Amino acid sequence: MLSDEQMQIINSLVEAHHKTYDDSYSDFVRFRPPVRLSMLPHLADLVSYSIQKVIGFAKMIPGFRDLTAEDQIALLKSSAIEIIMLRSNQSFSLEDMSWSCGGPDFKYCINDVTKAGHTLELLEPLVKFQVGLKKLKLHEEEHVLLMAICLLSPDRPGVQDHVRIEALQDRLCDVLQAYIRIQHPGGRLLYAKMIQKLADLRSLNEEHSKQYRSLSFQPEHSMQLTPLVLEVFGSEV
Amino acid sequence: MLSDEQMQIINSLVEAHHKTYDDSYSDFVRFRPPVRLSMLPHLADLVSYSIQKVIGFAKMIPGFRDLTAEDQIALLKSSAIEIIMLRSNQSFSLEDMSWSCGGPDFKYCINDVTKAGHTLELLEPLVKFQVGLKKLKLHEEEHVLLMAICLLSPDRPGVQDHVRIEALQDRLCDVLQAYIRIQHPGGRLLYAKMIQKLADLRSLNEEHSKQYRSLSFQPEHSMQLTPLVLEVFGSEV
């Protein structure tokens, strides 16, 4: 069985996630509406709102607050698009092969994302990633542990206190691995599967940074982004 | 009577304005919706869209295109909020004392603007300005001439070719003054009235820059602005 320290970590992570992911999606009506690069305004707002949520989630991870502000920014700039891809799995549906956020207005199929300036070189692996992650049938606990582990990866450009963050991510990996053993029947191969998805996210991050570069180099498109998106996905150090 | 050169200038300005002001206001549905700082997202989009329109208007003013890009930026940064205040008179209604843009969703009373972070120190003079300008009952020709004259003011921080722009604004003032004499019955005092409104706009510009400074110094608010708003109302040279 798991210890109290590990149990408190799971509780903190679940609560943090319930505090920052609204299953009702009612805030989506405040975004610039979708149009079917007609979808860029709506998806820019969607991602902008999602980044604020990830920041809120990160601040409630045990020990993340105790990092320097530079390390927190470092981690968030490298990992934000990855956490968004992970957290979005919760709206992803295998039936529709789309992200369904509580209404046909906010049902995003792949072709919607084409009209925000992305190509299949990103959307193909993205959707296969969502499919595979959805098939893992992760417990809520496992889902939130993976986001925290992804966020707390020391192997990011810009990180200062490599030792401290690797310790944090070590703790979470131990929690996850113990959780999968005790609470997840038939979980013998699950941890390795989850670690592989982390590797998949690195390649999706790379392809996304590529396509974001092309858009942000055209002011008529980058002007449709939000200030927070420009800050987080931008290249400043 | 007026000459052909002056007549062509009036025609060019009217056409430019008809090309950049949509009386149907149908684009407003694409803005983040209004909420009744709940109105900041919607009004930020409104102003952002209006700035693009003013740029489009400026580019069709005779001779503005022939300025250096620095002078064009100089003029636009100083004068954008003034042209917006002028051009908005076309949606302003004396009956409602509001700006009515083709629907109750896009009817902006003063209290809406309070919920975007402004105080009566701006909204009081703004609305009195709209009232007085509305009472002048300007001809379309006179309305567009005043916007071009306001845009082409050499007395702006940053302007390089003071002589060239003053010549341009001289030409337009001559056109306006001749137009008011020949085509506007009872226009004997109109030119002076219009020149005074230009002075009124300087003070509204000043009060607005003040309140924009306070908002933009709070990132939780400035993050709701658009990139174009931040560029134009910002202080870079």
């Binding site: 604020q52 920041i55 601040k59 502000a69 927190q72 920014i73 968030l76 700039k77 200030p227 927070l228 800050e231 987080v232 400043e236 | 709070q218 990132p219 939780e220 400035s222 993050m223």
Partner: peptide
């Protein structure tokens, strides 16, 4: 630099 991120992070 990182004006918004520093806020938000409190």
């Amino acid at each position: 630099r990182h004006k918004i991120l520093h806020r938000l992070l409190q």
